[PDB]
């Protein structure tokens, strides 16, 4: 605390990692954590610094989300994670525990030492008698060093008996196969020691190539030395949580800051085995501590996760970014990933929804935000129900045309509303240092309009936050209902009539001369301005303030609109042949063709309408729909042999056919099964029609004839669903559109 001996330096932090977690000599309510910073100077020179924080049980229970966690359950897990030779997959038992640990440690470090940000200039003040950093401040001394990447290519062949995988999958009927592989490796870690590995690390000024026939034996092919990538540093600290001096051995990257791995074939076990080998051969000489060996990802959960990532919580000390390949925007993807890592302190996406606020602090903020509001909006919030209808005054199939149809949207209104109400409820935050987390959210809201990565982060973050606290969902629903009420009230006086929408995005019909195009473009802008101003005023009414000013965007002007369901709608402009189709399922490559066929057929059918002809027009339309179905089925015959074209996507939340045993012999192909599963259907014999997981077998595939009749019937059901609605809406018919698949073209695939 004495400033007469603090040494102040001007540096920048590239990575913050968890090094050790221990229990002070006499404590049963709090523990201590030692964290490790990889710092750099203004010209590029790695340095290693250490910080020590204390975490109480209350913060741990808050970040966990429930009161069934203890200090012992954290200390024991952290101690067991220090030895990867026996337990290399400790977070696989309880990922939530390690997420809470990381989030709470990061919050405590941000609160005690000071405000810390990555890739930013900082004033670091340390105590030379202790060796730890005691203060972090934000200053300005020039342009920091530009982050550097290093390409990584790791391939491993871990041999696991398929019987174990089958047993684990039978234990959990909807378990992703990547998690099964990871659990099988966890049960018998020796499989990682006897695996064959190839490593290729390409930095800017060197190269590191290694080929291990067996990881426990010397390499059979070598290029470069370990001393060119990383430098081993031994630092002696004297923390206040220990009675004696403690030394620590760390790896310091040289001429790079993070690894970038292309995502065409990414295998977590390969990197896990490589890092375990590095940990074993580095931390072998006695006389030093051992860093925790923990990782996180979407394969550490039974049902997986939609966003692929690989978070390094401990050893070695620098992150690894997995980026999809074969995209010409790979540079932009890497830049966006790095920006998201820097902005959100590296906790996202590992922690999840705990980057903004702990899950046990949301109810108070929501209660305060709902309390302040306004009495009518409070009544609406108290009465909100998810399956409600307020203003969408159209119905099952109905058509409008020729009129002036317009679609409006509020880009990212849920995230802005959440960030606005969090600051309203911030007065109910018991901890005054939690606001910084909300501050992070605010930054994203500012960066959403111009940075697509911020938009994606918000789109994946807001639903998770709502899932964490249902009261937040109810509050957002109530405020959105009030916004929609104001939208309807204001639109009732600008020659507008809302026909559908939820409040964030909507569509309606104007009242102007259909023929005049020089007078239709002058009313739409006026209505846009009026709606924008009214929504802004109504939001300002309830003390709800927004950072980014509101900007209602017009998505297009059309002339005909057809609705066949609550989520499907087709807009068409009969002057430039543009159209927009919504509500059509797309679960495979065979549905895009159906969507295009539907769009073209609808264009032709609604173009015939301008002939002013009676019911005969409906018969002509039915003829064209049947012709379109015939042509679609005929063109689907030339792709009867393609297995990827007919495969459909299945999420872990839907029932699916059981996995054939041979699918457990894929090997390294089972690692890339985070979320989805592509299933095709074949006919082995007489009317069997079994299912096949396409992506679990090596190419090329040798399969029986594909069951094209089943998939074509599934597609034709959706085709008829929209054609029947269009027919019943445009002409007011009552006859369902049915295509005789069985009696016309079923012989082709028989």
């Amino acid at each position: 605390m004495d400033t007469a001996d603090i040494v102040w330096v001007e540096e920048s932090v590239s990575a913050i990692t968890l090094y050790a977690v221990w229990l002070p000599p006499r404590a049963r309510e709090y523990f201590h954590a030692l964290v490790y910073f990889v710092c750099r100077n203004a010209a590029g020179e790695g340095r290693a610094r250490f910080a020590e924080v204390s975490v109480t049980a209350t913060e741990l229970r808050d970040f966990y989300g429930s009161a069934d966690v203890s200090v012992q359950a954290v200390v024991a897990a952290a101690r067991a994670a220090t030895t990867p030779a026996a337990s290399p997959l400790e977070p696989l038992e309880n990922p939530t525990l390690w997420r809470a640990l990381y989030a709470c440690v990061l919050a405590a470090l941000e609160r005690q030492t000071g405000p810390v940000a990555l890739f930013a200039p900082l004033r670091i003040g340390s105590d030379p008698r202790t060796g730890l950093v005691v203060k972090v401040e934000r200053a300005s001394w020039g342009p920091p060093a530009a982050p550097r990447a290093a390409l990584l290519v790791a391939e491993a062949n871990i041999d696991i008996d398929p019987m174990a995988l089958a047993a684990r999958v039978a234990e959990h009927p909807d378990a992703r196969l990547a998690w099964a592989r990871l659990a099988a490796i966890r049960d018998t870690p020796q499989c990682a020691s006897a695996a064959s590995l190839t490593v290729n690390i390409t930095t800017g000024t060197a190269l590191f190539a290694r080929e291990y026939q067996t990881l426990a034996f010397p390499p059979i092919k070598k290029e470069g030395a370990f001393g060119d990538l990383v430098e081993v540093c031994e630092v002696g600290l004297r923390p206040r949580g220990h009675p004696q001096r403690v030394t620590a051995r760390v790896l310091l990257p040289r001429d790079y800051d993070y690894f970038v791995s292309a995502g065409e074939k990414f295998s977590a076990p390969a990197l896990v085995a490589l890092f375990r080998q590095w940990h074993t051969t580095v931390h072998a000489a006695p006389g030093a501590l051992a860093p925790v060996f923990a990782f996180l990802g979407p394969e550490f959960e039974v049902r997986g996760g939609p966003v692929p990532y690989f978070a390094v919580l401990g050893f070695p000390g620098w992150p690894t970014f997995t980026v999809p390949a074969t995209a010409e925007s790979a540079r932009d993807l890497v830049r966006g990933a790095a920006a998201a890592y820097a902005a959100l302190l590296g906790a996202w996406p590992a922690v999840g929804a705990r980057v903004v606020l702990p899950p046990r602090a949301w109810p108070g903020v929501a209660s305060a935000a709902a309390g302040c509001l306004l009495p009518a909006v409070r009544e609406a919030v108290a009465r909100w129900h998810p399956a409600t209808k307020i203003i969408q005054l159209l119905d099952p199939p109905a058509a409008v045309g020729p009129v002036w149809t317009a679609r409006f949207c509020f880009p990212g209104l849920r995230a802005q509303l959440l960030a606005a109400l969090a600051d309203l409820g911030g007065s109910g935050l018991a901890d005054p240092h939690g606001r910084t987390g909300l501050a992070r959210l605010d930054a994203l809201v500012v960066a959403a309009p111009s940075e697509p990565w911020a938009g994606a982060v918000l789109e994946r973050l807001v639903p998770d936050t709502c899932n964490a606290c249902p009261a937040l969902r109810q509050l957002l629903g109530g405020v959105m209902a009030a916004v929609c009420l104001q939208i309807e009230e204001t639109a009732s006086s600008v020659k507008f009539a809302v026909c559908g929408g939820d409040g964030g995005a909507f569509w309606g019909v104007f009242n102007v001369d259909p023929q005049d195009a020089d007078a239709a473009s002058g009313v739409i802008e006026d209505a846009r301005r009026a709606i924008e101003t009214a929504v802004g005023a109504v939001l300002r009414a309830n003390a709800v303030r927004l950072r980014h000013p509101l900007c209602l965007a017009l998505e297009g002007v059309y002339t005909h609109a057809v609705a066949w369901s609550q989520a499907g709608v087709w807009f068409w402009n009969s002057r430039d042949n543009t159209d927009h189709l919504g509500g059509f399922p797309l679960r495979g490559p065979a549905y895009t063709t159906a969507a295009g066929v539907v769009r073209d057929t609808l264009r032709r059918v609604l173009g015939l309408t301008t002939a002013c002809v009676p019911e005969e027009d409906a018969l002509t339309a039915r003829g064209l729909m049947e012709d379109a179905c015939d042509r679609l089925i005929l063109d689907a015959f030339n792709k009867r042999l393609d297995a990827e074209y007919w495969s459909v996507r299945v999420s872990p939340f839907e029932a699916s056919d059981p996995l054939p045993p041979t699918a457990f012999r894929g090997g390294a192909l089972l690692d890339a099964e985070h979320y989805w599963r592509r299933v095709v259907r074949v006919c082995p014999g007489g009317g069997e029609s079994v299912g096949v997981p396409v992506d679990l077998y090596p190419r090329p595939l040798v399969l029986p004839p594909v069951d094209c009749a089943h998939h074509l019937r599934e597609i034709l059901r959706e085709i008829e669903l929209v054609f029947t609605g269009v027919l019943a809406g445009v002409w007011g018919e009552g006859g369902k559109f049915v295509y005789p698949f069985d009696d016309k073209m079923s012989f082709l695939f028989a």
Binding site: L634, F637, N638, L641, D642, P660, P661, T662, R665, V682, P684, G685, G686, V690, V692, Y697, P698, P700, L701, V702, L703, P704, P705, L748
Partner: protein
């Protein structure tokens, strides 16, 4: 059927153009029913690691009765007919090449 669809249907639903053409020798697989089952099982074992569904048969005197009793009377012709009518998905040899053991059929 008009266009390329007619050609595709004619090629995919009739014998190969060179199937019924005189040749100096025969290049098929001919054997009795039991040996034919043995060769069929070997070919199926060769083909499963790439996606072909397993047969999973049932025979009298087994430890599980289950359904589909019929013994080796009609379960040999059906599999042979299904294997013979399966075409080739490009330059790769067809499935029957795993039983005839010739990458030119």
């Amino acid at each position: 059927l008009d266009g390329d669809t007619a050609k595709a249907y004619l090629r995919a639903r009739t014998y190969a153009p060179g199937a019924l053409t005189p040749a100096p020798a025969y290049c098929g697989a001919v054997d009795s029913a039991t040996k034919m089952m043995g060769r069929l099982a070997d070919a199926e074992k060769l083909l499963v690691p790439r996606g072909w569904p397993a047969f999973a048969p049932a025979s009298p005197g087994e430890d599980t009765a289950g359904g589909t009793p019929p013994p080796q009377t009609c379960g040999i012709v059906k599999r042979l007919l299904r294997l013979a009518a399966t075409e080739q998905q490009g330059p790769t040899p067809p499935a029957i090449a795993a039983l005839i053991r010739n990458a030119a059929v």
